[PDB]
Amino acid sequence: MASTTRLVNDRKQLEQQVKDDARILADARGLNITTVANDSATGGQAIRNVG
């Protein structure tokens, strides 16, 4: 029970902080949206009324 028993939590906090400041400064470069089309047809068997 000393300062050596606080290393794992220290690493957790350090990891979270590094993940945050690695993204605050990263540049924002937006991409161009493409591949948009109507390709969601639905199949099945017809009714074919008899008479």
Added chain:
Amino acid sequence: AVELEQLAAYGLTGAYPRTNHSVDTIVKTVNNISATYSTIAQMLSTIDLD
């Protein structure tokens, strides 16, 4: 009409009817029968009925 020996053989072996066709084919055939009756009925009503 069946004879006794055939029925006895069928019962002893515990046979049951079995098929591999799907449902839709049979209902399609029944629809075809109904259609061929309705066609004749329409022809008779539009030509001969008097």
